[PDB]
């Protein structure tokens, strides 16, 4: 609405419209339109619907703005894989379930634009750190 520029970063859902909760007064009071965004954004999120793909916005002035789609959350795909729709208060005590390393191939093949790791082995053991504290165990590995 007013003459203001600067920066912006948030995390709205993927295949879900943008009502008042997502943006509205949030990124609207920075001189921008929600309408033209309720479309363009949810336009690229269709290829990856049923999640919440983080995306940063850049403001300039007047009624100008941009956006950069990222990779949707991967806690949803696993929950479905474990038949659970809620997290765990105790990630060491009461854990979630168990997967296979094949599920990590597609992790470092879509999240490669962000993963600045060395080569394979690097980002491959990087993602495990996120899995290890969530509530999911590693299958197989070295030796044996």
């Amino acid at each position: 609405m007013k003459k203001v520029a600067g920066i912006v970063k948030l995390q709205l859902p993927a295949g879900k419209a943008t009502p008042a909760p997502p943006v509205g007064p949030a990124l609207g009071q920075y001189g921008a339109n929600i309408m033209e965004f309720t479309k363009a954004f949810n336009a690229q999120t269709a290829d990856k619907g049923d999640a919440i793909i983080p995306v940063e916005i850049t403001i300039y002035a007047d009624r100008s703005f941009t956006f950069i789609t990222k990779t949707p959350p991967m806690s949803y795909l696993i929950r479905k894989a474990a038949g659970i729709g809620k997290g765990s208060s105790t990630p060491n005590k009461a854990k979630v379930g168990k997967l296979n390393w094949d599920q990590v191939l597609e992790i470092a093949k879509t999240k490669m634009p962000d993963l600045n790791a060395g080569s394979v082995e690097a980002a491959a053991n990087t993602v495990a750190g996120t899995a290890r504290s969530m509530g999911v165990t590693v299958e197989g590995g070295p030796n044996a």
Binding site: K2, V4, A20, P21, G24, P25, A26, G28, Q29, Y30
Partner: peptide, 12 residues
């Protein structure tokens, strides 16, 4: 403004 998840906010 005023919340993280229902509907209002902040902005200046």
């Amino acid at each position: 403004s005023c919340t993280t998840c229902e509907c209002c906010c902040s902005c200046s």
